[PDB]
Design a protein around this nucleic acid. Structure first.
Lengths: 93, 78, 97, 73, 105, 103, 95, 83, 97
DNA sequence: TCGGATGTATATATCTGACACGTGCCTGGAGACTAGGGAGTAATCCCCTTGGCGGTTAAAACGCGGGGGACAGCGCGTACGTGCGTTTAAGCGGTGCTAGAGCTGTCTACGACCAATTGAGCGGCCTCGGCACCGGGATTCTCGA
DNA sequence: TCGAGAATCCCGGTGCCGAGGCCGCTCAATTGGTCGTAGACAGCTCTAGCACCGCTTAAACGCACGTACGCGCTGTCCCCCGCGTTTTAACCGCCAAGGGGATTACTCCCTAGTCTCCAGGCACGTGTCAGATATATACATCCGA
C-alpha cells in the first residue's frame, strides 16, 4: 500500500538552494530519518512542557520555548526569526 | 565573586574523592569547570521560568533542568 | 612532634568519606549564583531550595570528576593530579568537544 | 654462638659471635661482610638500645637470638 | 490559493504536519499556529544541511551527493556536530586526522 | 474495593486514573493497572527491606537517606537500574585505591 | 489548602509489613515518592511507545510485561514478571 | 542446528584494519584476544532486545527495523534504514 | 632488496583506510557469529539481510570509536603501542560495565 | 647532504544501471457552519523574600623549614614490523522450494459514558522518647629510638 | 621491633523537637447498565530466505630476520606539606517592609466536529548519461649513500 515519505519537499528545497545538483536514494533515506527524528523530539518536548505547566493545549509559544531549549544559540535565534516571520505572513492574509 | 569558592573548600571536595597529593592550577581549572556547569544549568532554569510567566525561580525549574541533561535528582518533590 | 607527609591526608580522606555534609560555604555560592544569573535576566528572585538543589548537584558533579581524575593520575604511574588529567578525563567522557 | 639479624629489606643475616663480642666487634663484622659503614646501624634486641662500650652478654643475649637493625641516614 | 502551505509561502506541507500532531497523541487539543512554526523550523534546518552538503560535493567535483558528503558536512561544522553527537550515519566514514607526535620526526 | 480482590497494598484506582489521564493510549485494559501495581510494590519492598537491614547494622531505629544510598549502591542490579541518579545527603562508598596506602 | 496527593501511607504500610519495628524520616519518604514516580513514568512511556509502534490503540497486560522485561535486568525482571502474573491470576479468579 | 567456534571467525588482519581506521600505529601481541571478548558483549546486548520485539509481534523473522528500535533504545540512533 | 623502515607502511595504510568508506569485516563469518549468538535466546530464528548489515555497521562504528579512545589513552601514558589495560581504562571512564 | 625505485595523482575511453521525468488515478485535504468549554482578565489576600544590625568565633590567610616526589640520561633485550611462499575459504553465479509474511471478511466480547452513593484518604492537633549534645575513660596507631 | 603521645572509639547522662497517632471532613472510587467497535480468528496468495553446487583467486597463515622501543636503574632539584600566628566574615538571632504567588469570579472566541467536493501525491513505467572499470603516464616521496 501507500508509504508516506518526504521526497518532493526535500527535492524542492534542494532545487531552490542549488539549481543543478542531484542526490541518491541513500541520502534521501538519511534525510527522511533526520527530519522524522527532529519532529519527534520537538513535538514530544513541547507536549511534555505543556502538560508540565498544567495547560491542556499546545500553542506556538510552547514550540518556541522547545526550540529555544533544544537548538543551541545562533541557529535557535535564526529559527525563531523564521518561525515568527512565517506566522505573521500566514496570519496577515 | 568566582574567587569566593575558597581553596580549602576545593581541597576538601577533592579529599572526599580520595586524592592524596594535590598540586598545581587544578584550583583554577575547577573554578572554570564549575562556572561552565552553572552557566548551562542556570540558562535552562531561567528559560523554564521565563516561559512560566513568573519572577521567582522555584525548585521545580532546577529539578526539571537537571532532568533534561540526564542528571536526575531525588529529594525535592520532583 | 611532627608527622610524616601523607598521614593527615589519609585521616582527612577517611573523615570526609564517612560524613555526609556539604563542604562549600553557603553565602559565597549564593552570591556566585546570583551574579551568574544576573546576565540572563535582571531583577530575579531565588527560593532557598533551588539554591540548595544547585549546590548538591555541583558537589556531586565535582566529586565524580575528581574520581575520574584520580583514576587517570594513578594510571600514568604518578600520585599527584595535574590539569592535563582533568582535560583527558573530560575529553573521554564526551563533554568537551 | 650464632645470631640472626633482621633488616628492613626482609633479609636475615646469620653471624657467629660470642658473649664477649662487644658492639664494636659485631658492627665491624656487619661492615666487613655487608659493606655497610658502622655509623648507619642501630641495633635492638629485646626492645632495648645499646651503648658501644658494652659487651654482647650485658643484654642477656642468648644463642639463636633475633636482633633487629635500623639504617639511619 | 487553496493550500495552507502557499498561504505562508513555505514548501513543507502544513496539513500533513497538523494531522501528524493531532494523531500522535501529544495533547487533547492542538492550536492553529503550531504547524506553520514547525514547518518553518524543519525547512530551515533542511536547507542548512543541504547547502553544506552541496558545497562539500562541489569541492570534490562530483555532481551527485553520497552519504560521505553528508558526513563531512555534519562533522566539519561544530554546532551541527553538537546537535548530532549521538547519531551515526551509514557509509559516512571518519575525519582524516592524525595525532602530532605519532608522525615521523 | 479492587486492591482487596487482588491482595495488593498499592492503590489500583489511582494507577488506573493516572494511566487514563496520562495521554498514553486511547483506551486501557482492565488488567494493566494490577500488573503495574504489583511490580511497583515488589520494587519498593525490596528497596525498603535492604534499607532497613542497613539501618539495623548501624544500630538505629529510623531510616535516613544515607541508609538508602548504602542499600542502593551495595546491590549490583539496583545500582545498574539507578545508574544516572544522585541522592541528596547520600555520601560516597568508603573505598581507597591500593597504591595510595602506605607500605 | 491544595490537595497534594502522595504515596506516603502505602509505603509506610509496606515498611511495617516487611519490618515491624522500624520508623522512617520525611526525607526518605520524599526519596521513595520520587523513585516510584520515576519508575512509573518510565514503564508507562515505554509501554505506550511499543503499543503505538505495533499500530494498536489498546494497551494491555502483555505490553506491560514486555516493557518490564525490557527495562529491568534479568533477576528482577523475572521476579517482577512472576509477581505480576500471580496477581493477575488471583484477581481474575475472583470477581 | 547447533553452531560453534564462530568467534574465531573475526580474523586478526581484519582487527588490524579496524584499528588502523581509528588512527593506531603500533599493536601489542595480547590485544587481539581481549577485543574478541568486548565485541561479543556488545552483540549479546542488542540481539537480546531485538528478539524480544519479534516476540511481541508474534512472528518468526527478525526484521532490520526491530534492530533499529533496539539500537535506538541504547541511545545510539542510526540513520539509513527507515524509521 | 629494498626494505621500508617500520612505521612507514603503517602510516600509508592509516591514510588509505581513513580515506575510504566501505566496511572491513567479511560477511559470512559475521553472519555465522550472529546466528550462533541468536540461537541461544530462541531456537529456529530467520534473519533478514538488512538486519545483519545494520548490525555490522553499528558494531564497526562502536569498535572504531573504542580504538580511538584507547589510542588517546596510550598516547597520554607516554607510550606508542596500545595495551589491554588502556582498553579497560577507557571502558571504565566511559561508564560501561 | 644525492639518486634509483616505488607508490600515487592525473588523463582518457566506455558502458551500464541507477536517476530524472511523464501518466493515471485514488483518498486525504480544503471550504462553510455550529457549539461549547478552556483561556485571558480583573480583584484580593497574606506569605515568603529582601534588607539590615550586632557579636562571636571558627575558619581563612600568611610565612617557614624540609623531605619525598617528578623528571631527565643511559643501557638492554626482547617483542613486533616487513618480506615471501603455500594453503585455504570467501565470493560470484545460476537453480529449487516452501515456509511464512501480508491482506481480506466476520463477529464478538470488551471498554467508554453515565446516574447514584458512600467511605478512603487528606488537613489539622497534640503528645513523647529516640536522637543530638556533652563529659569521661579505654583503646589503637604512629614517629624517634 | 619498640615505647610514649596523641587521636579515636566506647560509655553514660541530659534535654528537646520531629514522628506516630488521633480526629473531622469532602470528592473520587464503586455499582449497575447500555452501546458501539478493535481485534481475534480463519483463510488465501505470493515472495524471499534457506540449501545447493561449481569455479576462481584474492586473502589468510606460517616462518626468518632485524632493530627500535618498554622498562629498570640512577641522580638532582624543588614544590607541596605540616605547623604556628594574625586577620576576617559567616552565621545566628532578631526585626520591618512589601511584592507577587495563589484563588475566585466572569466573560468571550477558538477549535473539534460535520459534510461535500476535488486535486495533490502515490505506484508504474521508461529513456540516458555520470560514474565505476580499465589503461597509461608524469610527479612526489622514501631509504640507501
Amino acid at each position: 500500500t501507500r508509504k508516506e515519505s518526504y521526497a518532493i519537499y526535500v527535492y524542492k528545497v534542494l532545487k531552490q538552494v542549488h539549481p543543478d545538483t542531484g542526490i541518491s536514494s541513500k541520502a534521501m533515506s538519511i534525510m527522511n530519518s533526520f527530519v522524522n527524528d527532529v519532529f519527534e523530539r520537538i513535538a514530544g518536548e513541547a507536549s511534555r512542557l505543556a502538560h508540565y505547566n498544567k495547560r491542556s493545549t499546545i500553542t506556538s509559544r510552547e514550540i518556541q520555548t522547545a526550540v529555544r531549549l533544544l537548538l543551541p544559540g545562533e541557529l535557535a535565534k535564526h529559527a525563531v526569526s523564521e518561525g515568527t516571520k512565517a506566522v505573521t505572513k500566514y496570519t496577515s492574509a | 565573586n568566582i574567587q569566593g569558592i575558597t581553596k580549602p573548600a576545593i581541597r576538601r571536595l577533592a579529599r572526599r574523592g580520595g586524592v592524596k597529593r594535590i598540586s598545581g592550577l587544578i584550583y583554577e581549572e575547577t573554578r572554570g569547570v564549575l562556572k561552565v556547569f552553572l552557566e548551562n544549568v542556570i540558562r535552562d532554569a531561567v528559560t523554564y521560568t521565563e516561559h512560566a510567566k513568573r519572577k521567582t525561580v522555584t525548585a521545580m525549574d532546577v529539578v526539571y533542568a537537571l532532568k533534561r541533561q540526564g542528571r536526575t535528582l531525588y529529594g525535592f518533590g520532583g | 612532634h611532627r608527622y610524616r607527609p601523607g598521614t593527615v591526608a589519609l585521616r582527612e580522606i577517611r573523615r570526609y568519606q564517612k560524613s555526609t555534609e556539604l563542604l562549600i560555604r553557603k553565602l559565597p555560592f549564593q552570591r556566585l549564583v546570583r551574579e551568574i544569573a544576573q546576565d540572563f535576566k535582571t531583577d530575579l528572585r531565588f527560593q532557598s531550595s533551588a539554591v540548595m538543589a544547585l549546590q548538591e548537584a555541583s558537589e556531586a558533579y565535582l566529586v565524580a570528576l575528581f574520581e575520574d581524575t584520580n583514576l587517570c593520575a594513578i594510571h600514568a604511574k604518578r600520585v599527584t593530579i595535574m590539569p592535563k588529567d582533568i582535560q583527558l578525563a573530560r575529553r573521554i567522557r564526551g563533554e568537551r568537544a | 654462638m650464632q645470631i640472626f639479624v633482621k633488616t628492613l629489606t626482609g633479609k636475615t643475616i646469620t653471624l657467629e659471635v660470642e658473649p664477649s663480642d662487644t658492639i664494636e666487634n659485631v658492627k665491624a663484622k656487619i661492615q666487613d661482610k655487608e659493606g655497610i659503614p658502622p655509623d648507619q646501624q642501630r641495633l635492638i634486641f629485646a626492645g632495648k638500645q645499646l651503648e658501644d662500650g658494652r659487651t654482647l652478654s650485658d643484654y642477656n643475649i642468648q644463642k639463636e637470638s633475633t636482633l633487629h637493625l635500623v639504617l639511619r641516614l | 490559493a487553496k493550500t495552507r502551505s502557499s498561504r505562508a509561502g513555505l514548501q513543507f506541507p502544513v496539513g500533513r504536519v497538523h494531522r501528524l500532531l493531532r494523531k500522535g497523541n501529544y495533547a487533547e487539543r492542538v492550536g492553529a499556529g503550531a504547524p506553520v512554526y514547525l514547518a518553518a523550523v524543519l525547512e530551515y534546518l533542511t536547507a542548512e544541511i543541504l547547502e553544506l552538503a552541496g558545497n562539500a560535493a562541489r569541492d570534490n567535483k562530483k555532481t551527485r551527493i553520497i552519504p560521505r558528503h553528508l558526513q563531512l558536512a555534519v562533522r566539519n561544522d561544530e554546532e551541527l556536530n553538537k546537535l548530532l553527537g549521538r547519531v551515526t550515519i551509514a557509509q559516512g566514514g571518519v575525519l582524516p586526522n592524525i595525532q602530532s607526535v605519532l608522525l615521523p620526526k
